[PDB]
Amino acid sequence: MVPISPIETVPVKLKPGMDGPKVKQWPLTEEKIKALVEICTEMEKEGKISKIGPENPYNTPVFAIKKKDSTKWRKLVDFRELNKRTQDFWEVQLGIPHPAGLKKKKSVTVLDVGDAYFSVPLDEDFRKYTAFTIPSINNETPGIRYQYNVLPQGWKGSPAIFQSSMTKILEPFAAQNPDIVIYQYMDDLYVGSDLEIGQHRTKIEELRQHLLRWGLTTPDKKHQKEPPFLWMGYELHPDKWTVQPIVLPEKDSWTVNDIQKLVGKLNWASQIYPGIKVRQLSKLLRGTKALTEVIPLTEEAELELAENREILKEPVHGVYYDPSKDLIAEIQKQGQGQWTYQIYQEPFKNLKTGKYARMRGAHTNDVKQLTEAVQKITTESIVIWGKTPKFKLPIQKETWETWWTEYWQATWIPEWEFVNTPPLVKLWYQLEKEPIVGAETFYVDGAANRETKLGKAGYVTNKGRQKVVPLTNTTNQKTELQAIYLALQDSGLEVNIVTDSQYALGIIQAQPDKSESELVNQIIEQLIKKEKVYLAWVPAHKGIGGNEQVDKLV
Amino acid sequence: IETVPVKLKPGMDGPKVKQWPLTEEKIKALVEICTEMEKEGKISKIGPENPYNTPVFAIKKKDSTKWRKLVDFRELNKRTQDFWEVQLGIPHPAGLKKKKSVTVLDVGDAYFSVPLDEDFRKYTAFTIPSINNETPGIRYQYNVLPQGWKGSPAIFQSSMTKILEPFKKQNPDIVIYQYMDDLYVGSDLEIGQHRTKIEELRQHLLRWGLFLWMGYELHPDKWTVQPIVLPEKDSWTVNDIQKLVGKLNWASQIYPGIKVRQLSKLLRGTKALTEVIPLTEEAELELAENREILKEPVHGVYYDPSKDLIAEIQKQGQGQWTYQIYQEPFKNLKTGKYARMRGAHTNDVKQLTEAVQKITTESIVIWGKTPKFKLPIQKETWETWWTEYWQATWIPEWEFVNTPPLVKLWYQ
Ligand SMILES: COc1ccc(Nc2nc(Nc3c(C)cc(/C=C/C#N)cc3C)nc3nc[nH]c23)cc1
C-alpha cells in the first residue's frame, strides 16, 4: 500500500432560505429498473454512491435512457431542482484565452483525467441533498436509496470544484516547472513546452509521478489528438492559429435566423479575416423578432456579402505571440461607421484582426469613432497580451492636435503614428473663436405651434437682408435648425450667426460631421463650404436686437 | 485581538464585481505583493465556494517607485452596514480647513494589525487575473482589516484614538482627522516646525508598533475660491455686450436682483457683431449695480450631511480646469480653478484624473466626504485610462456628461 494524499473537499452550501430537493421519483419500466440497479451496483462498488436508510427526506428523479438503439442502458440523474437550490460558485472558465496571445509550443501532450474526477469527494454534509431512488420491481419492495460521495455529473458545483481541485494539485508542479504550460479543458489536461521531445516526455512522466501522489493515473497511451486542435471554434496549430472553416451557405432566400447565423459567422471570422463587413447585413435585423420571416436583401447587403465571400475564399492564419518583439495595431476606416484593424509584430504577419462599429447615436464624427476604436483595441490588447500596442492611424498629427486642444471633452490616444493610407480621418469644419470683421451678421430664429405644427424660420442681418420661410409639420427645434441653415445658404464664405437656440448649439458644439437628421447634415455640408463661421449664442426674450422672435411669433 | 462582528445591509449580498484587465507589470507587482501578504497572514487563498469579487489594481503613490495594491471596495462599501460605532460619526472637524498647513499621511498599514470577523471575510474576495486567461486567477480574501474598506477606519478607531493621546494632549491645537487609510494633520506652525511635528508623530507611530514616511502637504488657508466677475472695458462691441448679457442672465439664476434691461437696450436694431457700442449712463449704472451684487455671497447656501456633494468639472483649455462643488443647483459650496502642470502637458485624461483627485482631497478636508463627479469625458475613454494616473487610496463616484454645457466660458 502506497499512501496517497487525500483531495481536500470543498464546503458546499444550499442557497440561504432554501432546503434540499424533494422531487417525486418517476414510474419506470421493469426493463429500466433492472438496468438502473445493475448500473448503480457497479457505481456503488466504485465508491461513487452509497446506499442510504429511510431517514433521508430528499429526492432527485432518476432516468434510464437507451444508448443509440443498442442493448445497453445509460442512467440520468436529473439535478435541475438541486441546481436551482445550490449556491453560486466561482466559475473559473469565464473568459477563454485568445490564440493570438499564446506562445508557440514545440510539443503539446494530451492527458485524460476522466478518472481523477472520481477521486474528488463531495462535501460530506452536502451528500444528503443528492439522494435518489430506484423504484422497485412492481413497487412491492421499498425503492433502493442512494446518495453521492463524488461530484455528480450534471450537478451545479461539479465543474468548478473539479477544476479548482485539479488546479490546487497541479500548482506546485507548474510553479517548479516554469518551462511548460498546463491547461485543463474538461476531461483533458494539455501539457505544452518548447522542449526537445525527450526532455518534454520526461516532464510528462514527471507529471504522472506527481499526480500519483493523489492516487491519480493518466492512462498513458496515445490519444487520438495530434495538432491541429479543434478548440472553442479555433484550430490550434504548432506555429499558427486560425478559426475553424467558415462556410457561408448559398441561398436564394434568407430568413431573420439565416442572417443572424450569417453575421455571427462573420463576426467570428473577423478576428482573423481582415476587412470583413457586417453593417448592411446587420441593419436588416433591425426590429423584427420573427425568426421565420423571410427578409429581402438590399442590393447594398448583397454587395457586402459578395465582398465577404471573396475574403473568405482564402484560408488565413494568425501567428502566435513573441514577447521579444513589438506590438503594433493599425486601423482603417471602412465607411458607414465601420472600422477594421490588424494587430501584428512583423509586417504582413497578423496576430489577429478585428472590427469596430459606430455606436447608437444622433450625431457623430470620424475622430470620435477612431478614438473609440483605439480604446476598444487598447482594452482587448491588454486582455490578450497585457500591454497597449503601438498604433498606426489614418489621421494627421496636426489634425489630432487641433481636435483634442479645441474639444470640450477630455480625450486621449496612446502612443501612435500617422499612416498615410486613404481614406484619411480629418476635421470637416472649424468654427471661429471671435466675431469676424467685415462678415455679414445674421440674426436667426425659428418657432412652431405645438398644436398646428405650423412654424417659421428665418433671419435678419446688419445689411438689411431678411428672410422668413413658412413651414409645416415642424417643431421649435427643427425651426431653430432651419433658421441657421437658411443663414448659411444665403451668406458669403464668411458669416457671423446669432442664435438663441441652446439646442442647436448643443449639437454644433459637439462638432458632428454626420447625423441622423438630414437637416443637421445639410447644415454640416454648408459649414464645410464656408471659409469662416462664427456662431454666437444669446438668451431668448431679453430684448436683444436682431434676435427677431417677432417675424416668427406670427 | 478580538474581531468586532460585521454584517452587510438587509437583503443585500456581497459584491460580485468584475475584475477589469490589468497590464503585465501591474499583475507582476500584485503577485509579489500578495505573495508576501499571504506569508504575513493578512490574506488567504480561497476556494470556488466563494463567488464574491471586488476589483483590484496597482498604483504608484505621489513621488515613489514602489507599487501599492489598491482594492476598489466601492461596491462593498455601499453594501456594508451603516457603521455606527462609538464615534456615532465624529462630527467633521470644521477647523481643519482653516489650518495654515495640513499634512496627509498613509496609515493604512496599521489596519493589518487588526483581525477581521471570520464570517465577513468572504466578502473581501478579490482576484489577481492572468494575462489572456491563460492560468486560473489567484483568488484571495482578507484575514485582517483591508485598506480602502469603509469599515477599517471605523473599527480601528478605538485603537487609533489611544495611539494618538500622548501626541494630542501634548499638542492641543493641532487638528487630526482620519479618512479611510489617510490621516489629515493640520497646524498653524512654520513648515519646518510643522514638518517636525509630523515626524514627532510618525516615529510616534513606529513606536506604537506602526509608506507612512510619505507626506502630502496642503494649504487650506490659501485655497482657490471664485467670485463671478464681469469684464471692465473702455470699448464694448455688440458681441461683448451680447456675451455679458448671456453671462448676467445665467448669474441671475444664482443672484436675485441681476438686471439686463439697460444693457439689452444697447442691442436694438440689427447691428454688426464687431460694431462698438458706447455705454449709456443707465447701462453703466446697471452694470455697476450687478457688479456690486456679485460681491455679496449667494443667498441660502448651507451644507447638508444627509445629501451627496456634487462636483462638476469643465475643460477650459491650455491645461486649465474649472470646477464647482454643490448639493443644490446654483448653490455652490465651493468653486475653484486648476492649471497644474503635473506631467500631463499632452494628456487631457491625466490632467482630469489629477483634477479629480485634488477636488476629492479638498472635499474630504472641508466636509469629510467625497463628492460625486460629473466628468466631461466619454465613459469608454475614462474607464480605459484613469487607473494609469491614479495615486490616491480612495476612489470617488463619477458619472459622464456627453452634452457640452453652455456655461463653460462663464466660469472662465
Ligand atoms: C498546438 O496547439 C497549441 C496549444 C497551445 C499553445 N500555447 C500555449 N498554451 C497554453 N495553454 C493551452 C494549452 C497548453 C493547450 C490548449 C489546447 C486545448 C485544446 N484543444 C489551450 C491552451 C490555452 N498556455 C500558454 N502560455 C503561453 N503559450 C501557451 C501552442 C500551441
Swiss-Prot record, chain B:
Effect of residue 48 to G: 74% loss of polymerase activity. 86% loss of RNase H activity
Record note on what altering residue 180 to V does: 58% loss of polymerase activity. No loss of RNase H activity
Documented effect of changing residue 179 to A: Almost complete loss of polymerase activity
Chain positions of motif Tryptophan repeat motif: 382-398
Known outcome of mutating residue 389 to L: No effect on RT p66/p51 heterodimerization
Listed result of changing residue 241 to T: 96% loss of polymerase activity. 45% loss of RNase H activity
Site residues (Essential for RT p66/p51 heterodimerization), renumbered to this chain: 385, 398
Effect noted on mutating residue 168 to R: In strain: Isolate PV22
Effect after changing residue 386 to L: No effect on RT p66/p51 heterodimerization
Protein residues bound to Mg(2+) 1: 106, 181-182
Reported effect, residue 163 to L: 80% loss of DNA-directed DNA polymerase activity. 23% loss of RNA-directed DNA polymerase activity
Impact reported for residue 385 to F: No effect on RT p66/p51 heterodimerization
Resulting phenotype, residue 185 to M: 27% increase of DNA-directed DNA polymerase activity. 10% loss of RNA-directed DNA polymerase activity
Impact reported for residue 61 to Q: Strong decrease in RT binding affinity for all dNTP substrates and in catalytic efficiency. 100-fold decreased sensitivity to ddNTP inhibitors
Effect of substituting residue 180 to I: 54% loss of polymerase activity according to PubMed:9533880; increases polymerase activity according to PubMed:9657675. No loss of RNase H activity
Reported effect, residue 106 to S: 5- to 12-fold decrease in affinity for dTTP substrates. Strongly decreased RNA-directed DNA polymerase activity. Slightly decreased DNA-directed DNA polymerase activity. No effect on RNase H activity
UniProt-recorded name of the protein: p51 RT
Organism this protein belongs to: Human immunodeficiency virus type 1 group M subtype B (isolate BH10)
